[PDB]
Design a protein around this ligand. Structure first.
Ligand SMILES: CCOc1ccc(S(N)(=O)=O)cc1
Ligand SMILES: CCOc1ccc(S(N)(=O)=O)cc1
Ligand SMILES: OC[C@H]1O[C@@H](O)[C@H](O)[C@@H](O)[C@@H]1O
Ligand SMILES: OC[C@H]1O[C@H](O)[C@H](O)[C@@H](O)[C@@H]1O
Ligand SMILES: [Zn+2]
Length: 257
């Protein structure tokens, strides 16, 4: 199955997922000088006050914090988006070392990790139908650098020892994703794809310019997770990021002048 190792990693994915070589793949390098301010972007609205987290799952690639998406409890609107996008899950990508781990890069800079808050367009009824549409998903991406601890991340960090291996899950109710945001909502946006198989070209990417700071101790606990299942030889869950893909016939727009 696909993964991140030498024998099943990003350079192999195209054999089972030929869209890996498609026209709007993610992530990309964000060339900040080329990105253009877009006055047509409306104000971005992150409305997470009524979010209902449910569970945290190690899926063998990352860990997902899952939300109740059976109604508009936590939504993203505005910016480049037409209509309402409902939060379904968040997860991270991270490195073996602080010098790599992000999927998007900024003028080729790699951050230590990247948070993805995944939302689906409610006009399509369900996530599964949304991923058949060219505007089905919106992913809010947030870079992580290593410095001061992020207090709103600590609850996530502290549950990871209970989901060490692939297929383990734990209750994760009453988690507030607002504690993962930076101060500024300045962003870059472009049309792209899922960054993991099936690599579907459904995503409006919204990548915040301001990183959040997390402590070394916090990211070190991400790196204690395992890709493998219980009882199998330990393979640390590190370097679960896809590198930047060709921009092709796309422009990155900036929300800020
Ligand atoms: C088994 O070996 C595999 C399985 C899947 C893949 S891929 N194309 O999904 O990366 C490669 C080797
Ligand atoms: C069912 C797969 O759902 C996904 C896969 C990848 C992403 S990401 N890494 O592009 O945010 C989101 C949802
Ligand atoms: O033709 C001019 C237009 O070119 C496009 O590629 C840019 O996105 C627009 O901002 C610009 O106004
Ligand atoms: O908010 C997410 C989780 O944080 C901590 O683990 C709490 O002990 C738990 O009750 C809660 O589900
Ligand atoms: Zn992701």
């Amino acid at each position: 199955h696909w993964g991140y190792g030498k024998h099943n990693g990003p350079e192999h994915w195209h054999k089972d997922f030929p869209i890996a070589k498609g026209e709007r793949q993610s992530p990309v390098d964000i060339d900040t000088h080329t990105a253009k301010y877009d006055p047509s972007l409306k104000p971005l609205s992150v409305s997470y006050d009524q979010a209902t987290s449910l569970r945290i799952l190690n899926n063998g690639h990352a860990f997902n914090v899952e939300f109740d998406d059976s109604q508009d409890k936590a939504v993203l609107k505005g910016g480049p988006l037409d209509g309402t996008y409902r939060l379904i899950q968040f997860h991270f990508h991270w490195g073996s070392l602080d010098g790599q781990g992000s999927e998007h890069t900024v003028d080729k800079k790699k951050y230590a990790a990247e948070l993805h808050l995944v939302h689906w367009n409610t006009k399509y009824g369900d996530f599964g139908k949304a991923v058949q549409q060219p505007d089905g998903l919106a992913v809010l991406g947030i870079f992580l650098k290593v410095g001061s601890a992020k207090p709103g991340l600590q609850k996530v960090v502290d549950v990871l020892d209970s989901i060490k291996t692939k297929g383990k899950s734990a209750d994760f109710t009453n988690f507030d994703p607002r504690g993962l945001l930076p101060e500024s909502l300045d962003y870059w946006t472009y049309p792209g794809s899922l960054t993991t198989p099936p690599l579907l070209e459904c995503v409006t990417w919204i990548v915040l310019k301001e990183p959040i700071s997390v402590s070394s101790e916090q990211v070190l606990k991400f790196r204690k997770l395992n890709f493998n299942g219980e009882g199998e030889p330990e393979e640390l869950m590190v370097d679960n990021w896809r590198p930047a893909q060709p921009l092709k016939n796309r422009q990155i727009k900036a929300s800020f002048k």
